[PDB]
Amino acid sequence: HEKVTIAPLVLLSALDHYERTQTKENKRCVGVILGDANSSTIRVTNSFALPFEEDEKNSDVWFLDHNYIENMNEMCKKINAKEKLIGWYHSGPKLRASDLKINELFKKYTQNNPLLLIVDVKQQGVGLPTDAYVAIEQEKTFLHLPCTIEAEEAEEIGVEHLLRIRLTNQLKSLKGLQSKLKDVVEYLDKVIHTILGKLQDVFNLNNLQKALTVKTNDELMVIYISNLVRSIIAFDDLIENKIQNKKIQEQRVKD
Amino acid sequence: AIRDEIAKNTELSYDFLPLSNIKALLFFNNEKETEKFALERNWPIVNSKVYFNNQSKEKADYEDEMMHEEDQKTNIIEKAMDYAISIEN
Amino acid sequence: SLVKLFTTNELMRWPIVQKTYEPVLNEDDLAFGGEANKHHWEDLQKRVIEHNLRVISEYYSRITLLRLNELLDLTESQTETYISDLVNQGIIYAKVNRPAKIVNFEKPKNSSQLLNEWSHNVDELLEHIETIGHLITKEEIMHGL
Amino acid sequence: KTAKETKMLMNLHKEQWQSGLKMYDYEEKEESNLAATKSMVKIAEQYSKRIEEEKELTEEELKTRYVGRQDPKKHLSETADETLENNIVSVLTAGVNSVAIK
Amino acid sequence: IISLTYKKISLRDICLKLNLDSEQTVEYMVSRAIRDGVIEAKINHEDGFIETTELLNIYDSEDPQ
Amino acid sequence: TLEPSTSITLAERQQLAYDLSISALLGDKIYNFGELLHHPIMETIVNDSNYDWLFQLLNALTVGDFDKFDSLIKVQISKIPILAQHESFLRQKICLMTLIETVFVKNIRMLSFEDISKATHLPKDNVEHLVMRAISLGLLKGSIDQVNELVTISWVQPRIISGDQITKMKDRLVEWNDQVEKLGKKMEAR
Structure with missing residues (x-):
């Protein structure tokens, strides 16, 4: 497969488009991104917006103008020549007729496969409000690609100025196991087979574990070797203040 | 009380007790006295042998986090590892 | 063939x-x-x-020497002859117990147990979110269309 | 900064970005990565000794001879996380939840 | 002392060492021993010797932990 | 599975299933006869005129009678032993699908030689030789226990089947959620 690397500026500016106009659930904004799609790792260095109109009650009603992209691309040619159209993004989790058809309009100005991005304006749940998907056919099949956040040197330093272990993972691990139970129950009501066949093979990975218990305590015993170091650390913690404690009685004679 | 403590060695450890030999060990004048002693001790009786099925103890009200529990045993291991973390922090 | x-x-x-x-x-x-x-x-x-x-x-990871002679078309003396030759020449390795008459695979313990062999379970935990990410997208396509 | 700008930057760039999988952050890195990290842990325990041997063996007199001062505290904080990380994976070892019970 | 030196020892061999009373007497002194887990052995009457039940190899168990 | 493509009449659907009937005879790959049951193939054809070969061998796995399918076929396809060799795999493959979650809720994978001997209509001495031919041909991966006579397999191709299968798989996730109320509540408070 491929990889997608999105700068934090694109994901930060995409969510702002929802709050400024107070968009309701009947309208969904669409925008474009820039970068280099030639390599296997998709990098997004830029993003824009488009005056996209859509009807909620009718999935056959959509409006997209490609002339605004032509005038915008000519402006970028005088700014950055390495920026080309690698795809587009839309708002909202739902995929309807208006969202699937407009993907072909951007294929005219994009040589490679346009990157598909589903932006969550409510940022509800887990991380990564915008998932990176790729369009491929065997019916269009949208597959999930690994999402990594990497920026340049100057971009990562500027973010730190804006904001200026074990228990953390367990808090999110408890909600993840409960969410997987609902995904099976909700999928059952939709049928009354493809996902269930894959989950059964993944879940396949004490009959042979009768003799495999010894290796568990063997690793715990090696961890206890570090606990002996912790005892040595505790022994060294006992040496530290004795340097100061003996200097206390030395100051009693001086004072 | 003495004769009980004498026979308690073959109870919780030694498995299958003989028949005619127990007569000479505990100083029995009759062979039937061996089975009579097993009635008050509540022991199973088979041919020329006496077994012990009580090696596994259970019930006895309720027990939590003591003497090799099942679900609470994992917590005891997790609690012991968290004591060194709270002291270090 | x-x-x-x-x-x-x-x-x-x-x-x-x-x-x-x-x-x-x-x-x-x-x-x-x-x-x-x-x-x-x-x-x-x-x-x-x-x-x-x-x-x-x-x-066969573990097999009895008695039943092994019939599969290899060898006798009791001829079985251990070809086994010791492949080990000395650096071909294969196996376990041969003369008194027990049991032939095993002699699985190596040098894999560091849970440090390597257990790492094969990374595909179990990784494919969970991959199926969920594909399911949420698939359910919205058939619901909207 | 606004409310949307506050939660977005913390999920993208704060210290280092581990996000995109919240439950798989310390689960994948501290367990499935042992082959590239803690593999041959018996040798890894010898590295904790070489750090202590580099210090404790030098100045035992608590003065200036071999030119050292904080030598007992140099390997103290460095080996504290090694024991801590070994104690974290120890809890996550039982946290795999193999579904054993009886 | 005699149990650690001899894993399997006959019942009549102990009375010849300490000059005890009879084999019936020495059998019940081992009784009071392993009740609290002191000697940790077993008395086989049919075989006619006392065998030590300790196999060592306790490093792999959870008792040292 | 494709609805929009391959538009043909009803008479051509029977001839299309005729090639699908002879394709699943001499090989076990890609699930079994039960896969075409969910797809609009077996339900769209007729149960006579030698078009029932998909239906006959579907229930013949649990029954274990070769003479029922032999009487409905000709001498051409019945003279090859490969038909009877690969048919016994799907009889065991149904039992192989029980090694994830079926009976035991403790996540213990155990398969003995006696359960696969009566289901596949094969003797006990040929059980060891059957496993060797399965791994060698790339049909399945894993190992078997020759001491206690047990089988522990490796990654396989579980079918799209549902009901009792999804019922046991959702109960395991409950155990994952029950441990949230057991191990999770203790670590959250500490």
């Missing part, structure tokens, strides 16, 4: 195939030197036994 015979060879039909079709096998007068046909049975039987013990180690 003789090349693929090395995958499954019980040596039950090995003398049958050689006696039925023998173009180059039992009687070969072309591109083979020798004073007689005795070199055809000796050279061919010794090689197929070497390829036999290679695949059996990858299939």
Whole structure:
């Protein structure tokens, strides 16, 4: 497969488009991104917006103008020549007729496969409000690609100025196991087979574990070797203040 | 009380007790006295042998986090590892 | 089929195939030197036994020596002869217990237990979110269309 | 900064970005990565000794001879996380939840 | 002392060492021993010797932990 | 599975299933006869005129009678032993699908030689030789226990089947959620 690397500026500016106009659930904004799609790792260095109109009650009603992209691309040619159209993004989790058809309009100005991005304006749940998907056919099949956040040197330093272990993972691990139970129950009501066949093979990975218990305590015993170091650390913690404690009685004679 | 403590060695450890030999060990004048002693001790009786099925103890009200529990045993291991973390922090 | 015979060879039909079709096998007068046909049975039987013990180690991990002699077409003395030759030449490795008469695979303990062998479970935890990410997208396509 | 700008930057760039999988952050890195990290842990424990041997063996007199001062505290904080990380994976070892029970 | 030196020892061999009373007497002194887990052995009457039940190899168990 | 493509009449659907009937005879790959049951193939054809070969061998796995399918076929396909060799795999493959979650809720994978001997209509001595031929041909991966006579397999191709299968798989996730109320509540408070 491929990889997608999105700068934090694109994901930060995409969510702002929802709050400024107070968009309701009947309208969904669409925008474009820039970068280099030639390599296997998709990098997004830029993003824009488009005056996209859509009807909620009718999935056959959509409006997209490609002339605004032509005038915008000519402006970028005088700014950055390495920026080309690698795809587009839309708002909202739902995929309807208006969202699937407009993907072909951007294929005219994009040589490679346009990157598909589903932006969550409510940022509800887990991380990564915008998932990176790729369009491929065997019916269009949208597959999930690994999402990594990497920026340049100057971009990562500027973010730190804006904001200026074990228990953390367990808090999110408890909600993840409960969410997987609902995904099976909700999928059952939709049928009354493809996902269930894959989950059964993944879940396949004490009959042979009768003799495999010894290796568990063997690793715990090696961890206890570090606990002996912790005892040595505790022994060294006992040496530290004795340097100061003996200097206390030395100051009693001086004072 | 003495004769009980004498026979308690073959109870919780030694498995299958003989028949005619127990007569000479505990100083029995009759062979039937061996089975009579097993009635008050509540022991199973088979041919020329006496077994012990009580090696596994259970019930006895309720027990939590003591003497090799099942679900609470994992917590005891997790609690012991968290004591060194709270002291270090 | 003789090349693929090395995958499954019980040596039950090995003398049958050689006696039925023998173009180059039992009687070969072309591109083979020798004073007689005795070199055809000796050279061919010794090689197929070497390829036999290679695949059996990858299939049967633990097998009784009594039942092993029937699968390898060997006797009690001939079984340990070909096993010790492959180990000394650096071919394969196995476990041979003379008093117990049990032949095992002798699984190596150098894999550091949970440090390596357990890492094969990374595909179990990784594919969970991949199926969820594909399911949420798939449910919205059929619901909206 | 606004409310949307506050939560977005913390999920993208704060210290280092581990996000995108919240439950798989310390689960994948501290367990499935042992082959590239803690593999041959018996040798890894010898590295904790070489750090202590580099310090404790030098100045035992608590003065200036071999030119050292904080030598007992140099390997103290460095080996504290090694024991801590070994104690974290120890809890996550039982946290795999193999579904054993009886 | 005699149990650690001899894993399997006959019942009559102990009375010849300490000059005890009878084999019936020495059998019941081992009784009071392993009740609290002191000697950790077993008395086989049919075989006629006392065998030590300790196999060592306790490093792999959880008791040292 | 494709609805929009391959538009043909009803008479051509029977001839299309005729090639699908002879394709699943001599090989076990890609699930079994039960896969075409969910797809609009077996339900769209007729149960006579030798078009029932998909239906006959579907229930013949649990029954274990070869003479029922032999009487409905000709001498051409019945003279090859490969038909009877690969048919016994699907009889065991149904039992192989029980090694994830079926009976035991403790996540213990155990398969003995006696359960696969009566289901596949094969003797006990040929059980060891059957496993060797399965791994060698790339049909399945794993190992077997020759001491206690047990089988522990490796990654396989579980079918799209549902009901009792999804019922046991959702109960395991409950155990994952029950441990949230057991191990999770203790670590959260500490």
